[PDB]
Amino acid sequence: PPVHPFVAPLSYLLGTWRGQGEGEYPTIPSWRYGEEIRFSHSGKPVIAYTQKTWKLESGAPLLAESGYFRPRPDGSIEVVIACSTGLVEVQKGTYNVDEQSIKLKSDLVGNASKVKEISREFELVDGKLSYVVRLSTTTNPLQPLLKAILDKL
Amino acid sequence: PPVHPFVAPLSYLLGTWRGQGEGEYPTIPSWRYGEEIRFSHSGKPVIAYTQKTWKLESGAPLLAESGYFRPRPDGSIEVVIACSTGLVEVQKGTYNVDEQSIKLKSDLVGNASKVKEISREFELVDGKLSYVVRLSTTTNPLQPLLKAILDKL
């Protein structure tokens, strides 16, 4: 199907991406992971998102998440994500065509009592997809949790 | 990877399913759809769920959803789902090994102001996957919305 007009400004996402990331948080010693993301569509004003992570040495699976990105022509966007850990997120924010960036903050995090907010920010940098995930908890204000850079396949 | 012990009681789900369903609700004239569901895993105590629907005549895409099922050996289960419409669900309930059934009700429905609760109930019937989705809204109590039967491929 053709790309819906509302998806076309984010057409640079469409495809599969692979790279690696790092996590760290005040309670949690640093760790690294491999990551794959696929963005796809079926002609609707929605981009399907699917993601998985693995251990770098072995390729052993770690976690997975999936959901849907819903951009609108005013530059607004909402994103819904379900995670293999048992959390859900409703993310809302904006995308910027000139910067090839997407900036999201949670309206809601479901099923995760200690986690309060999650933000997710993407940027295309020299054709690579970079992001930062930030997380707050009851006692820790919003701050970096995950960062990754992925090459387009 | 081997099937995790917590997933093994639900191993009958694993695979791809295709069939058809029907929707109806007091505000909403009946409609029909084709449906495909895949359940998969990667050796963790989680089953990945992915679903799509289409128009019966043409195969034109309708909607999609995806998420994760997390069964536990006490018979409890939680399910998280993100939908292409922009909703999320946290579903909790039980599974019954003798009946090959799964009964879920939402703890949370996110990003959908009029929708209050969703329940989802699955049953294996003569090797086919059947479900019923029920929905409440502010003014309509919980009642059937969707029902479908799918054959295992």
UniProtKB/Swiss-Prot annotation, chains A, B:
Q: Where is this motif: GXWXGXG?
A: 15-21
Please list the residues that bind heme b: 27, 145
The pathway this protein participates in, as annotated, is: Nitrogen metabolism
Protein's UniProt keywords contain Transcription regulation: no
Question: Do you know which InterPro entries this protein is assigned to?
Answer: Calycin, Nitrobindin, THAP4-like_heme-bd
What keywords tag this UniProt record? Cytoplasm, Heme, Iron, Isomerase, Metal-binding
What EC number(s) are associated with this protein in UniProt? 5.99.-.-
Q: What is known of its domains?
A: Forms a 10-stranded antiparallel beta-barrel structure able to accommodate a hydrophobic ligand in its interior. In fact, this fold hosts the heme group, which is located in a wide surface cleft.
State the family named in the UniProt similarity comment for this chain: Belongs to the nitrobindin family.
Q: Could you identify this protein by its name?
A: Peroxynitrite isomerase Rv2717c
